[PDB]
Design a protein around this motif. Sequence first.
Motif, PDB file in Angstrom:
ATOM      1  N   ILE A   1     -50.407  21.289  12.230  1.00  0.00           N
ATOM      2  CA  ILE A   1     -49.626  21.891  11.356  1.00  0.00           C
ATOM      3  C   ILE A   1     -48.277  22.170  11.928  1.00  0.00           C
ATOM      4  O   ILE A   1     -47.409  22.302  11.124  1.00  0.00           O
ATOM      5  CB  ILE A   1     -50.325  23.455  10.980  1.00  0.00           C
ATOM      6  CG1 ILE A   1     -51.716  23.287  10.359  1.00  0.00           C
ATOM      7  CG2 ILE A   1     -49.489  24.262  10.123  1.00  0.00           C
ATOM      8  CD1 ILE A   1     -51.726  21.758   9.175  1.00  0.00           C
ATOM      9  N   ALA A   2     -48.342  22.256  13.172  1.00  0.00           N
ATOM     10  CA  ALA A   2     -46.907  22.410  13.823  1.00  0.00           C
ATOM     11  C   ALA A   2     -45.973  21.537  13.615  1.00  0.00           C
ATOM     12  O   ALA A   2     -44.877  21.802  13.047  1.00  0.00           O
ATOM     13  CB  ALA A   2     -47.084  22.164  15.441  1.00  0.00           C
ATOM     14  N   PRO A   3     -46.125  20.044  13.305  1.00  0.00           N
ATOM     15  CA  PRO A   3     -45.161  19.260  12.558  1.00  0.00           C
ATOM     16  C   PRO A   3     -44.501  19.620  11.316  1.00  0.00           C
ATOM     17  O   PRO A   3     -43.297  19.495  10.857  1.00  0.00           O
ATOM     18  CB  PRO A   3     -45.645  17.869  12.607  1.00  0.00           C
ATOM     19  CG  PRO A   3     -47.037  17.985  13.263  1.00  0.00           C
ATOM     20  CD  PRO A   3     -47.207  19.335  13.325  1.00  0.00           C
ATOM     21  N   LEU A   4     -45.546  19.978  10.398  1.00  0.00           N
ATOM     22  CA  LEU A   4     -45.157  20.617   9.121  1.00  0.00           C
ATOM     23  C   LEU A   4     -44.121  21.797   9.076  1.00  0.00           C
ATOM     24  O   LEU A   4     -43.272  21.908   8.363  1.00  0.00           O
ATOM     25  CB  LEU A   4     -46.285  20.879   8.351  1.00  0.00           C
ATOM     26  CG  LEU A   4     -46.842  19.496   7.545  1.00  0.00           C
ATOM     27  CD1 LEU A   4     -47.473  18.458   8.431  1.00  0.00           C
ATOM     28  CD2 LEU A   4     -47.941  20.087   6.743  1.00  0.00           C
ATOM     29  N   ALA A   5     -44.673  22.674   9.863  1.00  0.00           N
ATOM     30  CA  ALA A   5     -43.860  24.031  10.182  1.00  0.00           C
ATOM     31  C   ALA A   5     -42.538  23.709  10.527  1.00  0.00           C
ATOM     32  O   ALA A   5     -41.605  24.461  10.131  1.00  0.00           O
ATOM     33  CB  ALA A   5     -44.601  24.897  11.114  1.00  0.00           C
TER      34      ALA A   5
END
Lengths: 311, 312
Positions: free
Chosen positions: A285-289
């Motif tokens: 999810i980090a890349p989306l955040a």
Amino acid sequence: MTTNTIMEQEARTAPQKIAEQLLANDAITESLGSVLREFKPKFVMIVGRGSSDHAGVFAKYLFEIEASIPTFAAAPSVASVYGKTLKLAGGLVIVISQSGRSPDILAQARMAKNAGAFCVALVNDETAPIKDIVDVVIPLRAGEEKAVAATKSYLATLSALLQVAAKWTQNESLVEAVNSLPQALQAAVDAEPQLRAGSLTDVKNLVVLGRGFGYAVSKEIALKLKEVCAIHAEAFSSAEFLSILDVCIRDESYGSHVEQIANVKQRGANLIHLHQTSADIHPRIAPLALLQRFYIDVAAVAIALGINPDK
Amino acid sequence: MTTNTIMEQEARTAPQKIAEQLLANDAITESLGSVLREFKPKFVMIVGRGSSDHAGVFAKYLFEIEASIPTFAAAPSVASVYGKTLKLAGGLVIVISQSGRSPDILAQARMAKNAGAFCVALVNDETAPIKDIVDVVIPLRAGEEKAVAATKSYLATLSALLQVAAKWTQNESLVEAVNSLPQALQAAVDAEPQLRAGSLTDVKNLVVLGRGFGYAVSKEIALKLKEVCAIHAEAFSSAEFLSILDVCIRDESYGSHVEQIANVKQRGANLIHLHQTSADIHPRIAPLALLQRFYIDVAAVAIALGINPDKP
């Protein structure tokens, strides 16, 4: 600074729109997961805008890493210009298109269907004609796309891909990630800015470095910097890159990536760091955040550089 | 010869070296062709220098168009950083590496072999340890390169890929095009310059546009211009692009491409054209003839730019 741009408005609506998307698509993606475990795709081919398809690059890492199935982007010309029908028996084709109407997209969908692939379309317009070609439409539910620089619609594309991946693989970690996604985006919106204009004043050429999922999102960042800020920006792998913007994702790539950034800093480069807004977010999810934070930040950089990001 | 550079000298040997390569590799490519017709690869995955690999982009067009088999590049990080082994059973994996020693290339090859794939290596050093991992080795037979910028060795990678495709598919037109490749390359060498020596004075940023096979070679052209000319060059598809160097291949992509270029030029861009040196080159080898001409020309362009192409 914050801005009253449409770009920013759309970016700030993403967390709620994606929460609504995931809830509304839970049943259809669950059933698609059942179809895919039965069918057992030999490979995943992404149909969109060729190798320049940013969502497709993210999808490669997503399905290869979570599902262990080779994933790649189609080359539109092979279908449209060269008139070829590939041998795609036993393959999954995922069409990504907001409008679901472009003739080059519809030609590739038709060819995939004729080649025997099971065909899925991620599309924002549910009434689009792509629906009469492909086996199933997964609606992106992003709402009306009014800004010129895409933000929410891109994040909505990645959320749908992630949900499709979670339901198919049933990987428990990824399921938790998808369940945490809306709150993680909101946390990113509510966080302090990661990029400020001052870092870019006097920068005309910029290299965006990343690794793995970080590389996928670096392509999207380089594009927005070119689109909205008029900065010549280009994305590279920090592994392959033998004024730098460091896309720093805390996943399995972090260790090798960090060491490459330390090398460029020691070789005298000038660095701007995009760190995650939280050091405990799920890695998938980090890349989306990070993109979520950046989209809001870049509207303000634009306005600060005297550019209207909505024109 | 128009320059006294090592780069031009090596580039000028390519037609002879490639004729000799095809001759030396006829037996091994024939045998591989027979094995692949029995094996019936479900896809072709290319292992090289990232999901980037330029030879791999050419390989995608080649195998998808001539063999109708989906083809793509491996992402090294998936295997190295994320520690994943893919499900590659029933697939062909082609490892492209001049030295055949890079630990990463060897690791990807072992993963491919473990994952159940039939594995081929295109390598220049026949003694390299990649030979102990893969099923078949296709030597590139390019010899040493004393020039910093690859010319003959890149052409030799593409000719090996083409010969592999020709022997596997047995498409008559492709078989004929490969058999006549040396003549096409030598014709491109004897033709007049297409990229003129002084044509990039004061250009600091450049877009290289191509379509189809032309797009695949646009990538290599952009890289060489960065390497030998110190120009910030980037390759894009003329379909997606939505100072420009036009890679103009006369194949099925011609009509669409020519009008995309017509549009950028008429909207006021500074255009340079790389036309084929001949109108009647077989379409599938036209991309190598255009690269052949370009390798000789860019050595002269470097000089006109105050750069020594042998040591930039």
